[PDB]
Structure formats: C-alpha cells, structure tokens
C-alpha cells in the first residue's frame, strides 16, 4: 500500500534554562555561562609583572621607609598593596596623597 | 601571589580571560572582562528541548 | 488592598445544604472571574467552581456535578456558592478566590495587565456531623521550665488560644488538632519559659471559641 | 491529579525544584501556575503563565513548562520558606482548574535535636469527674521521625494519641506533644509512668519520672 | 512536532519512516552542520574577545572624602548598571536568534522534502508524511540522499491517492 | 487578509463561514490566549521592575564653578543620552516582537486549519477556504474544536472538486 | 532560487518565463517598491539625524594632572567604549533587518503567484513553476498583472497535471 514517513528534531532528558525576548525561562539541550563568578583565589604572577609590597604601602617604598628598602630602584606593572603594611618612620602627611599615588603607579 | 599564567587580575585573585562578563569584582586589571551585577547569564548553545 | 467578608460557615448536618458568600470591595468585581476552592482538613486542594464576569460561564468540579451551584450578584459585589447532599469527604475549608484562568472568563478590560490581579480568601470552614455543638473545657498543666494549657470537648473546630490578655508571642506552640473515636476535639498551648521566672510573673492563658459562645480563662502554675 | 511529587529537602541556599507532571489535556495545552500554602493561611499565588511573578513576589522563585512537565525553582531558599507549595492548571476536557497532589520542604536543620522534653500531669478539677489526662511535650527539634513509648509502669497500649507540629518559622525544629486519657478506675491512686523517647536525634531513649501527687 | 527524538546521537534533525519492510531513523546531515556552524560563529564572536584595560579609578574608598568621591561612585555606577543591562539584551537577544534559527533549520528540512515529492505524498500535519506508494528502504533513501525521482512513483500514488 | 473584523469581542482571532444553513462568526481561545500570555510576560519584565539610587551628585548649577561642574555636567548629559538611545530601540524592538508574535499567531491558526482538511477544501488566497462538501454548522464546529475528520467528507470533495 | 538574475536593471524581483511562443523576463514592481521604501525609512531614521554638543570637557593632556586627569580620561573612554559597542549592534541589527525583509518580500510574491494559479500549476522546487496548459504571453501577464483566471484553464491543466 503505502509507508509513512515523520520529521523531527533530537532531545536530552536534561537540558538547561535560558531567557529569551518571549520566554522568560525557557528548556534547551545546552548552554554555557558567559558570566564569570570562579575566583581561585590567588595572584597569578605572569604576565604582568609584580611587585608585593609586602609590608609597604607605595608611598613608603618613595620615600623610602627603612623597612621598605628591597624595593629600590625596582619596576612594576602591577603593585599590590597589602592592607596589613604600616609606615614604622616619621610620621607626615601627603596633600593630594590619592594623586601622587595615581601619577607613580602609572 | 601564586606561580601561574592569567591576564586578568582582580583583589579577589586572578580569572580566566574568556568569558566576555564578570561578576568577581569591579576593580580589574589586564585583559579583563567587564563586570556586570548579574550572578549568571546562560547563553544557549543547542535547540529549545522537549524530551520524550 | 482588597477588603472581603466571607459568611456561611458552620456546621451542617448530613445530606443538607450549605450556603457561602464571599463579598469583596477595593476592586472591580464587575471585571474578574471568581473561584470556588476547597481544602480538607489534613492535607489536599481540590477545586470546586468557577464563574465568569458575568455568568456567563459557570463550570463545575467533576466531584460535585450536578449538586452544586455557583452564583454571584454585581451590584452588591457578591459572591455565593449553593452545594447539597453533603457528607464527611466535603467537610472543608472553602476559598473564595481569583484564581490565574483562561482570559475569556475576565473582562475585556482587564485581559491585558502587569500586575495579574490575585487574592484567596481565608477559609470558610462547614463540618457534616451530628451537631452537638458544646462548650470546651480547659486544664492549666504545669510542674528550664514549661507550662501550658490543654482545652478539650468541643465539636466546632475554630479554637483560639491567647496568653495573659495576647502579649506572650514567643515559644508559643499551638497544637494541631486531635480526632478519636468519638466526635469532641481536644488542643493544648504550651511555653516553654527557662525556670527563673516562677515568683518573676506569673501567666494565665485564654481559649476563645466563637462558635459555641465561650471565653474561659485560667491562670497556670505547680500544685 | 496531577503528579507532584509529597516531599522536598535543601540547605540554606541551595535552590531547590519541585517538579509537576501533567497530561496532554492540561498542562500541554495551557499554562500552569505555582501557590504557596503558609501554615494557617490561604495559599498566596507565587508563579502564573509558568514564569510570571505578581508585584509581591521575589525574584527568587523561578519556572518553567516543557510540554507535560512544570518546574519551580526556589533559588534563594532560606529559613521562612518551609510551607507547602501547588501546582495547578487549566484542562479543557474536564473544562476545569485541576491542582496538585501538594510538596512540603523542609530546610538543612542542624540535627543538634535538643528537646525540651516535660511530663504534664492531670490537675483536680480535670479528675473531678474521673477524667486524667496526662501529657509530654518534647518542643525544638528537627528530625522529625520519633516514637514515644508510654511506660505506664511499663505497660503499652494500642490506640492513637498525638499532635505534630510544623517547622519554626524561624529555627527550622519540629516539636510534639503525647495526651493520654482515662478514668479514675483506672488512674484511683497513680502507682507510677512516665513517657520514655525513641528520636534518632540522639544515641539510646530516655525517660523521666511521673510519680504520684 | 509533538515531542522529541531522544535516540538519535550523531545529529539533530531526522526522520523516522515505518514501511512494510520495518522501521527506522536517520539522522539528515547537512541541516545539522549548518545549525552547527551558527552557533560556533556566535560563541566565536562572544567568547575570548576581551579588550585591556590597565589603569583607571579608584572605586573602594575608606576615607570620607566629599565631592569627588561622589563623582567617582557615580561615574562607576553608572557605567555598571548601563554595561549589565546591554549584556541582559545581548544575551537575550542571542538566544531568542539561536532558538530562530534552530527552528528555521527543522522547518527548512520538512519543506525541502515536502517539495521533493510533488503529489505523491500527502501533509498528514503532525510532522510525518504519508507516503501512498510501495517505498522500501533504498526509495528512503533516494529521498533523503535528495535523488528520489517522483516522476517513477508518481502515477501509482495518483491512483491510491484518489481511487 | 483585506481588512479585519470589528464585530469579534470575546477573542482576537476568529473564523467566519457562510453555509447553505446561513452565515457565522466565532472566534477561536487558545490562539488569543498564547498572544495574550506573551504580552502580559512583555509587561511584567518592563512594568514594576525599577531599582532604588539614593544619593548621587549635583545636577543643578547657581554658581560658575569652573573644571568639576564641567566633569559633572558631561557625567550626567552622557549617561541621559546613552539611557534614551537604550529606551527608544528597547521599545522599537519589543513593539517589532509584538507584530511579529501576533502575525505568526494568525498564521499558525491559519496553516493548523488548513492541515486539517487535507484535501477536501481549497486555498482561495484571501484568508478563507472553498470547501467542498455540504457542511452544518456542526461540521464547522468539528473543524474549529479540531475533532473534524477527513476521510469522512473526502471522496465527496475530491469528486466536486475535479468533475 | 539556485543564484541571482543579473540581466534585470529595471527592478529586483522578477519572473522569468519559457513558453513554446519564447522566452522572456521581467520584472514585478510593487515588491521592489516596497523593499526600497523601507530601506529609505531606515536610512532617512540614520542618515542627518545628529545632535549638538558645544561645551565638553577636555580630553587631550599635557600636563601630569594626577586624579582629576584620571577621572576625565575614564569618563570619556567609557562613553567611548558603550558608543561603539552600541553602534556595532545597531549596525548588526539593521543589516539583519534588511537581509529578512528582503527575502521576505521574495517568499512574499512566490507565495502570491502561487496561491493564484491554484491547481493549475505545480511546485517544482526550484523557484519555478510548471505551467500545465498553453499559455500565451498575455496569459503570463495576466499572471503577473494579478488578473489570472483561473476557472479558464483549470480543467484542462488537471486533465494534462493527471492523465
Ligand atoms: C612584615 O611584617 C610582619 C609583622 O610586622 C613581619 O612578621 C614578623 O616576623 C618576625 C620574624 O622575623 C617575627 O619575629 C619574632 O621574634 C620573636 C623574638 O623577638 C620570636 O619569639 C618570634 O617567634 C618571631 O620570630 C615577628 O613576630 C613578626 N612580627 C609580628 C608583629 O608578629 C614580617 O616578617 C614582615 N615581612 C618583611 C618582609 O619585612
Ligand atoms: C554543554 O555545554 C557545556 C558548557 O556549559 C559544556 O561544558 C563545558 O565544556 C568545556 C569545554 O571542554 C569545559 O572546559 C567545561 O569544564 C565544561 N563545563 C561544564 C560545567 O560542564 C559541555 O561539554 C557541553 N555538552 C555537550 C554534550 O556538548
């Protein structure tokens, strides 16, 4: 006599939910995320070059506070500065402190 | 300060460059993607699904 | 919000009828399908009926076909709800309420909106049993600490229990209900207050049944 | 009528789903809807249109439909969301609103269980008609599963007598209460008994003593 | 459709034919590779595209400063709330093409094979065809491959078709 | 279609069909019902969704301040036409999306009817269809409520539509 | 369609035509008025539409300012940065825009034609119809003109389409 003959499009038992313009919510069978949230958690130390400044706001390491001597004459791309350093030297003030520290970073 | 290779640096550590958004921090340095307030955002790679 | 009084509720011997009415005002009831849902003490939702903007539409629950009705009254923004040949499987709490439907039973005005007007009712609670309906009886319990009272013989289910004229919101347990072999039901309210506040202050509890006429009172401590 | 499964279970955050399977008649056919039953009130309405949250509502509930299949997706759940939770639709053939079997979840209750475990004794004027009901209430715990053996001078029964109460709005700890009753000639003088525990919140049961007075 | 095929793992769209000689499925090709491209082209787009940016603001503050530091925590919010409503559009935008696409593919298929046999077959509606001729396995075949004759068959489904 | 129909107020879209035993119009639900779905999501994602700002900077000048009202004033200019750019293709996007889902509407209905019967009717090209057989106001009412069976009326059209 | 007509320069979409009496082209006319009318809307909406800004801040640096330096240079390549990426899916979408409305008026007037010549032609499914009587030139204008009778020829097409 005669056959027949359907048409159809494949399917997962588990997919995922996405948003569209019509559905809020809507099933398909894969996804990825574009939204990074993972931070392992540390400094990688390549490529950019770095400076720790352990126990040494940049300031300190200018002017040159006793303690903050390993880092003269050094350079950097990126300064880390840590929020247990200190200043164990005479004490002053920088006006326009926030500038300065801008201009040498840079 | 770890012993890795990543181009983008945050205060909360270094991230993978790929993903074009980020929610880690707004603070970024290097080739770092732009920081969003959305938690996730899923991008569908495959058909709408409906299982038999 | 919307402000409802819901009224019908008691105790109706078998095979009788019932009569519910719920009536709303705050919105336009002239625009919006309404709902009759039931639920079972225990545990369970079972829908009842549904009616149009206009009465248009009535339809009905597959377990109360053809002995039940629904109607309703606009301009005195009126809901009711007709249901005879009652037994123990419909002793229930009745909601009144609008329910997300298809859109052909609300009004052509109110098809399209962002907010999805919504509201349940509180339940209209009817009982089926031989109504003899009697006054409770309570008992203050007592010797960390705890101390409580325990309210029995009563039939008609709407029991409230306050503290000290209702200030004592805290550790407050309210027991569920308890059926046995017999008809009467039995509930006790307990706290439990650390053991440094005997001669501190000294509590009364207060059980309040509505449907029998009863206010009863009784202060709690050891022997 | 509609397969909702009768309990769920989570932590403090962790986004947890209740499933809802329909017919070709229903759900296949027209959009669903998800309401949330608080302990002694009426059902507020979470989710309608399977993905649509009213001005009330938080952003934490989520839902979707794939044919035959409604989902709802709590993703912030935390202490005050233990209730129970509906799934319900619109079917053409019954041209009627069918609703859900019903869920109830629970939350990660630290499985500390301490109880405050007391023996409740029938006063005077309870007797005054040979009436003694003697109580024990074990308040603020979470497991859930326990027996309690009534130790009427170690001697059991075979009827039923209790009252479960629901997860603390707050604490997440169950609490239940044990009643008994009988007659003067059967309680004359009160020899001895007491209410020994069997929860699993602990190692091995325990009693306490309910002598006469 | 009324569902899908869960069986079917070396593509994504197919068919699935019951003739006298058994049943059986297949999975078309070509739909599946031009479905496939799209959305690599789009993750290409998307993903590893991230520009640098090495010195900027401050945006943490410990000191109250006054005016400029008002300024700052504005420019900075601003910024934030304007790139995380374009990315809410563009993914929302992505996807709804993605699921356009997807579709069009699945629908471009069943009209290409709808118009491979003129009249000897017949729109049953639900994504199947009716066949109304003896087709075995190597006339499947023919029609999928895309060299199926309906001049050959053509006659004899006129005559089951209408007598 | 040339125009459309005022006189439908319980629906969006409808049939109308002119038989032997007179002329009707009923409008068909659940086509209404997935357009009005779509547009009350529409609504609910714009409406009612607005975030809280509580302290920003100055935007109104009474004194010539010089370099930071200048800063200022350029923040604030450029975030309002950055936001009225995002506003106006926003909305020229989701009305685009509103046609576009209420015309695939009407043309779905359309295609599900004519996959119905078969080949008992013909498409006139006009928005309605020649039957080809007596047809009651039953009949049409099997057709609409979609329990209309073919095999029933189809020799009798095939025969009026070809001798 | 397999490819494009180059030979056409007096329109963009077209028929082409090989009856016993010669073959010709041409091309229709409302559908290419109507592609280009919406092609003019979009640029008359892109082209001219630009907007004043007389006072700015300063964006080139001279001299090492320190922070409020920093803050300008954020300002502006932020504007800068949202601009581009605003402009580049602008671009996108109205491109994707004119791709979809193009190839629908195509679809548009194929489905036109064939829904005039009801049975008495068929879909071959290469962009072609087949004809299945004579027909003249002034039958192909009648064709085209949208004046196609088709009660005339019908019954001989289907004695020619069937036996
Ligand atoms: C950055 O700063 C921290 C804290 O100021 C430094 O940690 C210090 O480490 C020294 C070791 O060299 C500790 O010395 C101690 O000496 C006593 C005897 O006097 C001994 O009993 C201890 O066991 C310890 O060795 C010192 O306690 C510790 N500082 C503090 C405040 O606890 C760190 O070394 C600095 N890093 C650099 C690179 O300068
Ligand atoms: C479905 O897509 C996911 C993306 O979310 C794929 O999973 C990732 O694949 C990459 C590529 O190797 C891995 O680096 C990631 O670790 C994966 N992430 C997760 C969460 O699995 C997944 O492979 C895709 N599945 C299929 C069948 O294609």
Redesign the pocket.
């Known amino acids: 006599p005669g056959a027949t003959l359907c048409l159809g499009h494949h399917a997962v038992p588990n997919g995922?939910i996405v948003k569209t313009i019509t559905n809020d919510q809507i099933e398909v069978?894969?996804?990825?995320?574009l939204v990074q949230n993972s931070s392992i958690g540390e400094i990688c130390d390549s490529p950019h070059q770095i400076l720790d400044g352990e126990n040494c706001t940049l300031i300190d390491a200018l002017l040159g506070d006793p303690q903050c001597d390993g880092f003269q004459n050094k350079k950097w791309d990126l300064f880390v500065e840590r929020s247990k350093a200190y200043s164990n030297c005479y004490p002053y003030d920088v006006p326009d402190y926030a500038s300065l520290r801008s201009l040498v970073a840079s | 300060i770890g012993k890795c290779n990543s181009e983008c640096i945050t205060p909360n550590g270094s991230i993978p460059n790929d993903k074009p958004f980020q929610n880690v921090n707004r603070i970024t340095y290097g080739a770092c993607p732009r920081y969003v307030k959305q938690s996730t955002l899923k991008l569908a790679?495959?058909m709408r699904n409906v299982p038999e | 919000q919307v402000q409802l009084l819901e009224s019908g509720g008691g105790v109706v011997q078998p095979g009788r009828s019932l009569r519910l009415s719920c009536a709303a005002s705050g919105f336009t009831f002239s625009n919006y399908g309404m709902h009759w849902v039931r639920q079972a003490p225990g545990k369970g939702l079972e829908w009842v009926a549904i009616i149009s903007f206009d009465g248009s539409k009535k339809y009905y629950a597959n377990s109360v076909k053809g002995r039940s009705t629904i109607s309703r009254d606009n301009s005195k923004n009126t809901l009711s709800l007709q249901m005879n040949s009652l037994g123990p499987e419909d002793t229930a709490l009745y909601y009144c309420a609008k329910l997300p439907s298809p859109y052909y039973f609300d009004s052509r005005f109110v098809w399209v909106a962002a907010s999805a007007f919504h509201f349940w009712g509180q339940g209209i609670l009817v009982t089926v049993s031989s109504a003899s309906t009697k006054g409770p009886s309570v008992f203050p319990l007592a010797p960390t600490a705890a101390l409580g009272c325990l309210v029995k013989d009563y039939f008609p289910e709407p029991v409230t229990v306050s503290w000290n004229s209702g200030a004592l919101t805290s550790g407050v347990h309210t027991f569920p209900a308890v059926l046995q072999s017999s008809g009467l039901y039995s509930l006790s309210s307990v706290v439990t207050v650390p053991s440094s506040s005997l001669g501190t202050q000294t509590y009364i509890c207060n059980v309040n049944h509505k449907p029998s006429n009863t206010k009863v009172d009784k202060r709690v401590e050891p022997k | 009528m509609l397969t909702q499964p009768p309990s769920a279970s989570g932590t403090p955050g962790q986004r947890v789903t209740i499933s809802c399977s329909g017919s070709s008649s229903n759900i296949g056919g027209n959009t669903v809807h998800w309401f949330q039953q608080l302990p002694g009130t009426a059902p507020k309405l979470l989710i309608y249109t399977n993905s649509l949250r009213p001005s009330g509502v938080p952003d934490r509930f989520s839902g979707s439909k794939s044919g035959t299949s409604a989902s709802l997706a709590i993703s912030g759940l935390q202490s005050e969301d233990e209730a129970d939770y509906y799934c319900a639709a619109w079917d053409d053939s019954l041209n009627g609103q069918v609703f859900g079997g019903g869920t109830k979840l629970t939350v990660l209750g630290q499985p500390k269980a301490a109880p405050s475990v007391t023996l409740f004794p029938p006063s005077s004027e309870e007797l005054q008609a040979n009436k003694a009901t003697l109580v024990c209430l074990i308040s603020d715990f979470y497991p859930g599963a326990v027996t309690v053996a009534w130790k009427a001078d170690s001697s059991p029964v075979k009827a039923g007598v209790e009252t479960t109460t629901p997860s603390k709005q707050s604490n997440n700890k169950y609490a239940a209460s044990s009643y008994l009753s009988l007659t003067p000639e059967q309680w004359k003088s009160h020899r001895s008994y007491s209410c020994q525990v069997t929860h699993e919140g602990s190692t091995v049961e325990k009693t306490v003593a309910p002598t006469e007075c | 459709i009324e569902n899908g095929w869960e069986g079917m793992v070396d593509g994504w769209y197919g068919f699935r034919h019951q003739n006298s000689e058994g049943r059986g499925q297949a999975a078309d090709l070509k739909s599946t590779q031009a479905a496939i491209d799209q959305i690599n082209g789009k993750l290409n787009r998307l993903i590893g595209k991230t520009n640098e940016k090495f010195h900027q603001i401050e945006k943490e503050f410990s000191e109250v400063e006054g005016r400029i530091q008002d300024l700052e925590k504005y420019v900075e919010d601003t910024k934030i709330d304007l790139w995380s409503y374009n990315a809410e559009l563009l993914v929302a935008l992505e996807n709804q093409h993605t699921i356009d696409l997807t579709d069009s593919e699945m629908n471009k298929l069943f009209e290409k094979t709808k118009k491979q046999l003129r009249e000897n077959a017949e729109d049953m509606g639900n994504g199947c065809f009716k066949i109304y001729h003896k087709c075995d396995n190597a006339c499947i075949g023919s029609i999928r491959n895309g060299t199926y004759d309906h001049d050959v068959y053509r006659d004899e489904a006129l005559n089951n078709r209408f007598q």
Not at chain 1, 29 to 33: K, L, R
Request: net charge negative.
């Open positions: 995922t069978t894969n996804a990825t995320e | 790679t495959g």
